[PDB]
Amino acid sequence: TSWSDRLQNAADMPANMDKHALKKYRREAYHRVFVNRSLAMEKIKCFGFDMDYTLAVYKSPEYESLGFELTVERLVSIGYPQELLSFAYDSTFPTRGLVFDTLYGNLLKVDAYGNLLVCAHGFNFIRGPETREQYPNKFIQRDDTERFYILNTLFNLPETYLLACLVDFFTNCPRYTSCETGFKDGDLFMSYRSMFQDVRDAVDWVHYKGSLKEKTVENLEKYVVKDGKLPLLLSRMKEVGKVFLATNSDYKYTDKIMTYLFDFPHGPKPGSSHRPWQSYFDLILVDARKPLFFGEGTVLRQVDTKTGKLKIGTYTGPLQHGIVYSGGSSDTICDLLGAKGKDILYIGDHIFGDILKSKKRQGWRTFLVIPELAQELHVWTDKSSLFEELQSLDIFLAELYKHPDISSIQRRIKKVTHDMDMCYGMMGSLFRSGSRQTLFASQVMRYADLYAASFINLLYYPFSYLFRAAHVLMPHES
């Protein structure tokens, strides 16, 4: 079972809008909206959406597998060895949010401070003291964006696995000789960083010049989750506020995916006339180029929807029914919809490009969609046992220190941590390794005001609702 399977099964279920059923439904964890900072939904005037992996959740592992095989084939066609074609995507290896160290070829799972939680060279997990050879302080400066690349979105799941496949392949192929920073084959030296760059470029190419979009659009049922409750939520949002779309995808792909997402024999609810997807939005903006969108942006353009090409020139006119925008900036949204940042709930899946930047740069309210959360929640409850253990041991270890045994328990902690981590996958949970929270976890807590397995979970809350977080206290305040 994949995380998308739980999403698809919830998506099959029609909306019972009886108010008692909604409170019952919302209190199950899979359907709940989780709260880091308090948000009074009554003060929200604009609900804004990203598309890919927010409204349009690609099915797993089919979509990653397609992206993987198309990327491998691109690498082979530019000259990588034919043995790459025998690679097959394996969904149990990659966890999202890993850091690839382009200097030493390692995949790293780090905490908010750059401390190493897991280090994997190819498929060989480097433990404790062996990592100190390359990481003397067991720590990396993630600010060093020239050396480290954070694989932050679900689109990066294929290359996460692919990078490990390649490091493993070149390490164990006898034509190549291993060095600290790459592989030599006679007079050709392939550094990990140039290998990383080829992988990044092939992923980009597959998405923007190869066949990924075509193959997706010609079998949408295979690749994209569909949910009849989407038009209902959006029309309800439209009753109390304005609704807008702001996506990095271009108009043609956006049109094809959104038409699929609303392709039901009805509109908001069964029985209602079907309406075009564009009628659910007061503002539609494509080619957003987030996160730049939340700073200077680019020039505001108008899409020719008959052709899907941009009209020549900068659009200077008013908000007008039927118009589709391209580029612009977050200020375009604020001016045209007459909103301030704290009037806006922006909903998306990119912790950096959608959530961190809109929060920090513009003061928008934020809702982070985490598709994996459905499966993470399944594992976290089912295996609460080892976590409570882990909490007990650290507490007991402290009392030992102030009073063998300590060395025995440090090893017992390490064994439990590993046992807990292996139940999510080889790279462990999205949110932690044992008792240590991941960088991704800390960034969710810091910048996502709300978060959920799906944006659809908002349907189960009235729009007067005050999402309440606990007041935070410093250690001395208790």
CB nearer to Mg ion: pick between 216 and 417: 216
**Residue 215 assigned to a binding site:** no
Query: Taking a C-beta distance cutoff of 8 angstroms, is the pair 181, 104 a contact?
Result: yes
**Residue 446 assigned to a binding site:** yes
The single residue among 44, 52, 122, 416 that binds Mg ion, judged by CB under 5 A, is 52
Q: Is 263 a catalytic residue?
A: no
**Residue 249 assigned to a binding site:** yes
Q: Rule CB under 5 A: which of 160-179 touch Mg ion?
A: none
CB nearer to Mg ion: pick between 120 and 368: 368
**What residues contact 448, with CB distance under 8 A and at least 6 apart?**
36, 351, 355, 366, 367, 368
Beta bridge partners of 148: 101
Long-range contacts of 7-11 (CB under 8 A, 24+ apart): 7/57, 7/225, 7/371, 7/374, 7/453, 7/454, 8/59, 8/225, 10/227, 10/374, 10/454, 10/456, 11/225, 11/226, 11/227, 11/228, 11/229, 11/456
- Angle at which helices 192-208 and 62-77 pack, to 10 degrees? 110
**Residue 427 assigned to a binding site:** no
CB nearer to Mg ion: pick between 156 and 438: 156
**Which one of 52, 111, 354, 449 is the catalytic residue?**
52
d(CA 286, CA 84): 35
CB nearer to Mg ion: pick between 34 and 53: 53
Q: 341 in helix, strand or coil?
A: helix
Residue range at the interface with Mg ion (CB under 5 A); choices 33-41, 49-57, 260-268, 463-471: 49-57
d(CA 343, CA 365): 8
Residue range at the interface with Mg ion (CB under 5 A); choices 50-58, 292-300, 363-371, 393-401: 50-58
The token pair at 212 is 């990924």
CB nearer to Mg ion: pick between 117 and 347: 347
**Residue 445 assigned to a binding site:** no
Question: Which candidate, 298, 260, 291, places its Cα nearest to that of 276?
Answer: 260
Q: Is 50 a catalytic residue?
A: yes
* CB of 356 vs Mg ion, minimal distance in Å: 14
**Residue 193 assigned to a binding site:** no
* CB of 369 vs Mg ion, minimal distance in Å: 8
**Residue 52 assigned to a binding site:** yes
Distances in whole angstroms, Cα of residue 12 to Cα of each of 25, 120, 203, 345, 373: 15, 38, 32, 26, 18
Q: In what order do the strands lie in the sheet with 188-191?
A: 177-179, 182-185, 188-191
**Residue 421 assigned to a binding site:** no
**What residues contact 449, with CB distance under 8 A and at least 6 apart?**
35, 36, 37, 39, 359, 365, 366, 367, 467
Residue range at the interface with Mg ion (CB under 5 A); choices 46-54, 260-268, 383-391, 429-437: 46-54
- Angle at which helices 373-382 and 3-11 pack, to 10 degrees? 110
What per-residue string of b and e applies to 212-239 under the rule 16 or more CB within 10 Å gives b?
Answer: bbeebbeebeebbbbbbbbbbbbbbbbe
Q: Cis bond leading into 61, ω under 30°?
A: yes
**Residue 60 assigned to a binding site:** no
Distances in whole angstroms, Cα of residue 394 to Cα of each of 215, 381, 414, 429: 51, 21, 11, 20
CB nearer to Mg ion: pick between 371 and 425: 371
**Residue 204 assigned to a binding site:** yes
* CB of 398 vs Mg ion, minimal distance in Å: 42
**Residue 156 assigned to a binding site:** no
d(CA 216, CA 223): 6
* CB of 248 vs Mg ion, minimal distance in Å: 7
Residue 287 interacting with Mg ion (CB under 5 A): no
Q: Rule CB under 5 A: which of 301-360 touch Mg ion?
A: 349
* CB of 3 vs Mg ion, minimal distance in Å: 15
Residue range at the interface with Mg ion (CB under 5 A); choices 51-59, 189-197, 321-329, 426-434: 51-59
Contacts with Mg ion by CB under 5 A: the residue count is 4
Judged on CB neighbours under 10 Å (0-12, 13-18, 19+), 249 is: buried
In terms of residues, how long is the chain?
478
CB nearer to Mg ion: pick between 228 and 291: 291
Residue 50 interacting with Mg ion (CB under 5 A): yes
Residue range at the interface with Mg ion (CB under 5 A); choices 53-61, 137-145, 400-408, 465-473: 53-61
The token pair at 63 is 């979509």
* CB of 344 vs Mg ion, minimal distance in Å: 17
Residue range at the interface with Mg ion (CB under 5 A); choices 45-53, 81-89, 266-274, 368-376: 45-53
Q: If you ran DSSP here, which 8-state letter would residue 301 be given?
A: E
Query: Taking a C-beta distance cutoff of 8 angstroms, is the pair 54, 348 a contact?
Result: yes
Give the start-end residues of each E strand in 198-280. Answer: 242-246
Residue 255 interacting with Mg ion (CB under 5 A): no
CB nearer to Mg ion: pick between 53 and 104: 53
* CB of 25 vs Mg ion, minimal distance in Å: 26
Residue 53 interacting with Mg ion (CB under 5 A): yes
* CB of 212 vs Mg ion, minimal distance in Å: 15
**Which one of 12, 18, 50, 185 is the catalytic residue?**
50
For the annotated binding site, the residues are 50, 52, 142, 152, 200, 204, 213, 247-249, 290, 349, 360, 426, 443, 446-447
For the annotated binding site for dATP, the residues are 142, 152, 443, 446
For the annotated binding site for adenosine, the residues are 152, 426, 443
* Binding positions for Mg ion, rule: CB under 5 A: 50, 52-53, 349
Which active-site residues does the annotation give? 50, 52
